[PDB]
């Protein structure tokens, strides 16, 4: 049965106005800005942007990839699909 989300988990993350997007739950570095309550730091592959999202917008990657893991015209998306599939735990700093 599912656990709560934890750093390192791979998802498609949904934001208003964008397609479900390959992403990971990030760690918060020592000294770094914490998310608001009930929110997770989401790192979007390809764009390499961070946003804070709750579980309603987080779809586990394994379950969702057949639906959401197809090329998209949007900037950074296809790079994002390569990242999540090929090196999802790398440093993208
Ligand atoms: C400015 C502000 N937010 C933006 N996005 C928020 C979600 C998004 C999906 C892929 O990367 C992150 C795009 C883009 N530009």
PDB file of C-alpha atoms and ligand atoms in Angstrom:
ATOM      1  CA  UNK A   1       0.000   0.000   0.000  1.00  0.00           C
ATOM      2  CA  UNK A   2       1.169   3.633  -0.693  1.00  0.00           C
ATOM      3  CA  UNK A   3       3.210   5.667   1.773  1.00  0.00           C
ATOM      4  CA  UNK A   4       3.320   9.443   2.068  1.00  0.00           C
ATOM      5  CA  UNK A   5       5.448  11.242  -0.504  1.00  0.00           C
ATOM      6  CA  UNK A   6       9.146  11.467   0.340  1.00  0.00           C
ATOM      7  CA  UNK A   7      12.237  13.174  -1.216  1.00  0.00           C
ATOM      8  CA  UNK A   8      13.431  11.226  -4.267  1.00  0.00           C
ATOM      9  CA  UNK A   9       9.948  10.119  -5.343  1.00  0.00           C
ATOM     10  CA  UNK A  10       9.308  10.551  -9.096  1.00  0.00           C
ATOM     11  CA  UNK A  11       6.031  12.044 -10.317  1.00  0.00           C
ATOM     12  CA  UNK A  12       4.259  13.914 -13.018  1.00  0.00           C
ATOM     13  CA  UNK A  13       3.394  17.251 -11.376  1.00  0.00           C
ATOM     14  CA  UNK A  14       0.401  19.302 -12.521  1.00  0.00           C
ATOM     15  CA  UNK A  15       0.262  23.071 -12.564  1.00  0.00           C
ATOM     16  CA  UNK A  16      -2.570  25.207 -13.971  1.00  0.00           C
ATOM     17  CA  UNK A  17      -1.932  25.881 -17.646  1.00  0.00           C
ATOM     18  CA  UNK A  18       0.778  23.250 -18.092  1.00  0.00           C
ATOM     19  CA  UNK A  19       0.653  19.543 -19.067  1.00  0.00           C
ATOM     20  CA  UNK A  20       1.394  16.983 -16.321  1.00  0.00           C
ATOM     21  CA  UNK A  21       5.173  17.418 -16.067  1.00  0.00           C
ATOM     22  CA  UNK A  22       8.043  14.986 -15.208  1.00  0.00           C
ATOM     23  CA  UNK A  23       9.301  15.982 -11.763  1.00  0.00           C
ATOM     24  CA  UNK A  24      10.721  14.782  -8.452  1.00  0.00           C
ATOM     25  CA  UNK A  25      10.112  15.505  -4.785  1.00  0.00           C
ATOM     26  CA  UNK A  26      13.266  17.337  -3.711  1.00  0.00           C
ATOM     27  CA  UNK A  27      15.085  17.439  -0.408  1.00  0.00           C
ATOM     28  CA  UNK A  28      15.352  20.808   1.327  1.00  0.00           C
ATOM     29  CA  UNK A  29      19.060  21.648   1.779  1.00  0.00           C
ATOM     30  CA  UNK A  30      20.325  22.792   5.171  1.00  0.00           C
ATOM     31  CA  UNK A  31      19.847  26.559   5.284  1.00  0.00           C
ATOM     32  CA  UNK A  32      17.413  26.552   2.356  1.00  0.00           C
ATOM     33  CA  UNK A  33      13.868  27.984   2.303  1.00  0.00           C
ATOM     34  CA  UNK A  34      11.238  25.516   3.605  1.00  0.00           C
ATOM     35  CA  UNK A  35       7.938  24.941   1.692  1.00  0.00           C
ATOM     36  CA  UNK A  36       4.639  26.087   3.258  1.00  0.00           C
ATOM     37  CA  UNK A  37       2.763  23.545   5.435  1.00  0.00           C
ATOM     38  CA  UNK A  38       1.350  20.561   3.560  1.00  0.00           C
ATOM     39  CA  UNK A  39       3.425  21.475   0.452  1.00  0.00           C
ATOM     40  CA  UNK A  40       6.371  19.611  -1.062  1.00  0.00           C
ATOM     41  CA  UNK A  41       9.320  21.122  -3.017  1.00  0.00           C
ATOM     42  CA  UNK A  42       8.855  19.914  -6.580  1.00  0.00           C
ATOM     43  CA  UNK A  43      11.782  19.965  -8.993  1.00  0.00           C
ATOM     44  CA  UNK A  44      10.575  19.936 -12.625  1.00  0.00           C
ATOM     45  CA  UNK A  45      12.877  18.053 -14.967  1.00  0.00           C
ATOM     46  CA  UNK A  46      13.909  19.761 -18.213  1.00  0.00           C
ATOM     47  CA  UNK A  47      13.003  23.309 -17.043  1.00  0.00           C
ATOM     48  CA  UNK A  48      14.831  22.704 -13.754  1.00  0.00           C
ATOM     49  CA  UNK A  49      12.311  24.994 -11.960  1.00  0.00           C
ATOM     50  CA  UNK A  50      11.016  24.431  -8.407  1.00  0.00           C
ATOM     51  CA  UNK A  51       7.480  24.949  -7.179  1.00  0.00           C
ATOM     52  CA  UNK A  52       5.666  24.024  -4.004  1.00  0.00           C
ATOM     53  CA  UNK A  53       2.764  21.634  -4.541  1.00  0.00           C
ATOM     54  CA  UNK A  54       0.427  19.427  -2.514  1.00  0.00           C
ATOM     55  CA  UNK A  55      -0.414  15.720  -3.231  1.00  0.00           C
ATOM     56  CA  UNK A  56      -3.507  16.606  -5.262  1.00  0.00           C
ATOM     57  CA  UNK A  57      -1.197  17.762  -8.045  1.00  0.00           C
ATOM     58  CA  UNK A  58       1.310  14.848  -7.756  1.00  0.00           C
ATOM     59  CA  UNK A  59       0.856  11.656  -9.821  1.00  0.00           C
ATOM     60  CA  UNK A  60       3.348   8.779  -9.155  1.00  0.00           C
ATOM     61  CA  UNK A  61       5.550   8.315 -12.231  1.00  0.00           C
ATOM     62  CA  UNK A  62       5.396   4.493 -12.598  1.00  0.00           C
ATOM     63  CA  UNK A  63       1.570   4.449 -12.571  1.00  0.00           C
ATOM     64  CA  UNK A  64       1.165   7.553 -14.781  1.00  0.00           C
ATOM     65  CA  UNK A  65       3.926   7.274 -17.376  1.00  0.00           C
ATOM     66  CA  UNK A  66       1.815   5.395 -19.952  1.00  0.00           C
ATOM     67  CA  UNK A  67      -0.591   8.357 -19.935  1.00  0.00           C
ATOM     68  CA  UNK A  68       1.643  11.358 -19.435  1.00  0.00           C
ATOM     69  CA  UNK A  69       5.124  10.359 -20.631  1.00  0.00           C
ATOM     70  CA  UNK A  70       4.782  11.294 -24.305  1.00  0.00           C
ATOM     71  CA  UNK A  71       6.633  14.095 -26.178  1.00  0.00           C
ATOM     72  CA  UNK A  72       5.160  17.571 -25.844  1.00  0.00           C
ATOM     73  CA  UNK A  73       5.800  20.808 -27.728  1.00  0.00           C
ATOM     74  CA  UNK A  74       6.392  22.789 -24.508  1.00  0.00           C
ATOM     75  CA  UNK A  75       9.884  24.109 -23.711  1.00  0.00           C
ATOM     76  CA  UNK A  76      11.990  21.723 -21.638  1.00  0.00           C
ATOM     77  CA  UNK A  77       9.440  18.891 -21.654  1.00  0.00           C
ATOM     78  CA  UNK A  78      11.234  16.338 -23.820  1.00  0.00           C
ATOM     79  CA  UNK A  79      14.510  17.020 -22.016  1.00  0.00           C
ATOM     80  CA  UNK A  80      12.474  16.433 -18.867  1.00  0.00           C
ATOM     81  CA  UNK A  81      11.290  13.024 -20.077  1.00  0.00           C
ATOM     82  CA  UNK A  82      14.901  12.012 -20.745  1.00  0.00           C
ATOM     83  CA  UNK A  83      15.942  13.107 -17.265  1.00  0.00           C
ATOM     84  CA  UNK A  84      13.228  11.273 -15.369  1.00  0.00           C
ATOM     85  CA  UNK A  85      13.888   8.057 -17.321  1.00  0.00           C
ATOM     86  CA  UNK A  86      17.702   8.222 -17.514  1.00  0.00           C
ATOM     87  CA  UNK A  87      19.104  10.080 -14.450  1.00  0.00           C
ATOM     88  CA  UNK A  88      16.223  11.187 -12.163  1.00  0.00           C
ATOM     89  CA  UNK A  89      18.397  11.491  -9.006  1.00  0.00           C
ATOM     90  CA  UNK A  90      21.269  13.534 -10.496  1.00  0.00           C
ATOM     91  CA  UNK A  91      22.339  17.023  -9.529  1.00  0.00           C
ATOM     92  CA  UNK A  92      20.820  19.446 -12.057  1.00  0.00           C
ATOM     93  CA  UNK A  93      22.391  22.494 -10.422  1.00  0.00           C
TER      94      UNK A  93
HETATM   95  C1  LIG B   1       7.354  30.601 -15.185  1.00  0.00           C
HETATM   96  C2  LIG B   1       6.741  30.176 -14.026  1.00  0.00           C
HETATM   97  N1  LIG B   1       6.251  28.938 -13.892  1.00  0.00           N
HETATM   98  C3  LIG B   1       6.393  28.121 -14.938  1.00  0.00           C
HETATM   99  N2  LIG B   1       6.026  26.816 -14.752  1.00  0.00           N
HETATM  100  C4  LIG B   1       5.393  26.283 -13.539  1.00  0.00           C
HETATM  101  C5  LIG B   1       5.240  24.797 -13.848  1.00  0.00           C
HETATM  102  C6  LIG B   1       6.352  24.521 -14.896  1.00  0.00           C
HETATM  103  C7  LIG B   1       6.153  23.190 -15.655  1.00  0.00           C
HETATM  104  C8  LIG B   1       7.550  22.841 -16.127  1.00  0.00           C
HETATM  105  O1  LIG B   1       8.437  23.631 -15.359  1.00  0.00           O
HETATM  106  C9  LIG B   1       7.716  24.306 -14.346  1.00  0.00           C
HETATM  107  C10 LIG B   1       6.244  25.776 -15.762  1.00  0.00           C
HETATM  108  C11 LIG B   1       6.992  28.568 -16.136  1.00  0.00           C
HETATM  109  N3  LIG B   1       7.476  29.806 -16.248  1.00  0.00           N
END
